Amino acid sequence: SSSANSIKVVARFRPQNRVEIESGGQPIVTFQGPDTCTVDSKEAQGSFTFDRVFDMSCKQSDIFDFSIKPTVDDILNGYNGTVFAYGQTGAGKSYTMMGTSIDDPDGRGVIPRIVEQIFTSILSSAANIEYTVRVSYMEIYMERIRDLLAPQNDNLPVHEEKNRGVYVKGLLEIYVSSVQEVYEVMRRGGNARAVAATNMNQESSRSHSIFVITITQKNVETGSAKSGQLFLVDLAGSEKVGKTGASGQTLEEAKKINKSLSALGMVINALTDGKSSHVPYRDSKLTRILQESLGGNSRTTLIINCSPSSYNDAETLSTLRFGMRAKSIKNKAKVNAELSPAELKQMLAKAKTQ
Ligand SMILES: Nc1ncnc2c1ncn2[C@@H]1O[C@H](COP(=O)(O)OP(=O)(O)O)[C@@H](O)[C@H]1O
Ligand SMILES: [Mg+2]
Numbered sequence: 438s439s440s441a442n443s444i445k446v447v448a449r450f451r452p453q454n455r456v457e458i459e460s461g462g463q464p465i466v467t468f469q470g471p472d473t474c475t476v477d478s479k480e481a482q483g484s485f486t487f488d489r490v491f492d493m494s495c496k497q498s499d500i501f502d503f504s505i506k507p508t509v510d511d512i513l514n515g516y517n518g519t520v521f522a523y524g525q526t527g528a529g530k531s532y533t534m535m536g537t538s539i540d541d542p543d544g545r546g547v548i549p550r551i552v553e554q555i556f557t558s559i560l561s562s563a564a565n566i567e568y569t570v571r572v573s574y575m576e577i578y579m580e581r582i583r584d585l586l587a588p589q590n591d592n593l594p595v596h597e598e599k600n601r602g603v604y605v606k607g608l609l610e611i612y613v614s615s616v617q618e619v620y621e622v623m624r625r626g627g628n629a630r631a632v633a634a635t636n637m638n639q640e641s642s643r644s645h646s647i648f649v650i651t652i653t654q655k656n657v658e659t660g661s662a663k664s665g666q667l668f669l670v671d672l673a674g675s676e677k678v679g680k681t682g683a684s685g686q687t688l689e690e691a692k693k694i695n696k697s698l699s700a701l702g703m704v705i706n707a708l709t710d711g712k713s714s715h716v717p718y719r720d721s722k723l724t725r726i727l728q729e730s731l732g733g734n735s736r737t738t739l740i741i742n743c744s745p746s747s748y749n750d751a752e753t754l755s756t757l758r759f760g761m762r763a764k765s766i767k768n769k770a771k772v773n774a775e776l777s778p779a780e781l782k783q784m785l786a787k788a789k790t791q
Pocket of ligand 2: 530671
């Protein structure tokens with residue numbers, strides 16, 4: 438499947454919230470198939486079809502079992518991937534990625550469920566396959582990278598080499614040998630995020646959070662070893678900045694519009710246009726770090742979080758369309774994992790009989 442490596446887009450509608458409900462908000466979204474929805478409102482109207490659409494009744498386990506679980510199998514097999522949670526503030530990005538509390542069984546989101554599955558597979562693997570797992574947790578705000586596991590470092594640099602790709606130099610990576618150790622890592626990172634949001638004059642809705650899991654596996658009988666990494670991204674709010682509606686700071690720092698949550702849109706536009714191979718990954722550190730996830734070597738899933746309320750019809754339409762544009766993007770289908778071959782040949786040479 439060299440072309441079936443398209444970006445998966447799933448839409449998730451949460452129930453209306455208090456402000457919508459008590460402001461005269463009404464449902465404007467109807468569901469057709471398990472992959473289609475229809476909006477009918479003053480500033481909406483339209484029919485959209487994605488790889489999957491979850492209605493207001495769908496629970497956390499549904500999200501995971503119907504569109505995320507397959508991703509864990511990919512990383513466990515040496516493939517790289519990324520899962521994005523996109524949408525306006527209050528749409529359900531964090532709830533979907535981390536959940537209300539990772540300690541509330543029903544309310545826990547994608548990430549903790551991914552970790553459980555990873556350790557469950559590892560533990561049931563043949564003694565012949567030895568695994569290693571390590572995590573990183575960072576936050577990007579105003580184009581500055583903060584290590585949520587080593588908070589003092591709040592301006593980490595981004596580096597890049599031909600023989601390695603893009604990485605954050607100095608980012609702490611912690612080996613974890615159990616579901617419990619990783620869970621505490623998630624709690625620590627959450628704590629660090631609240632600290633920044635509370636004491637650093639930083640808008641929590643305008644920062645991106647990235648959880649990185651890297652799994653290495655070695656077949657001790659063949660001496661062959663490979664790895665796969667998964668980036669779990671909770672993006673900043675996608676609503677229009679307008680520098681007029683939330684008490685804007687200095688008009689300069691209002692470079693918010695230029696930020697990654699804009700660089701992401703420009704990157705998506707360029708890829709869907711396809712007339713130029715010069716995609717603007719550099720417009721932001723987010724898009725540089727995740728450049729392979731957009732048009733490169735990666736199994737990518739985009740979760741667009743939407744409100745089903747007429748109160749937020751305009752933003753929900755903007756989000757759906759964005760999701761529609763990302764849908765037509767095809768990712769690079771090269772470099773599998775273990776030798777079998779994982780395809781039909783995978784030996785790009787030329788001839789060289791000698
Ligand atoms: N699908 C859902 N079901 C029930 N409550 C939800 C759901 N999705 C989101 N919420 C609630 O949404 C409110 C704000 O959502 P949040 O996930 O913080 O989203 P965002 O990060 O996109 O701002 C929270 O109090 C959250 O628990
Ligand atoms: Mg959030």
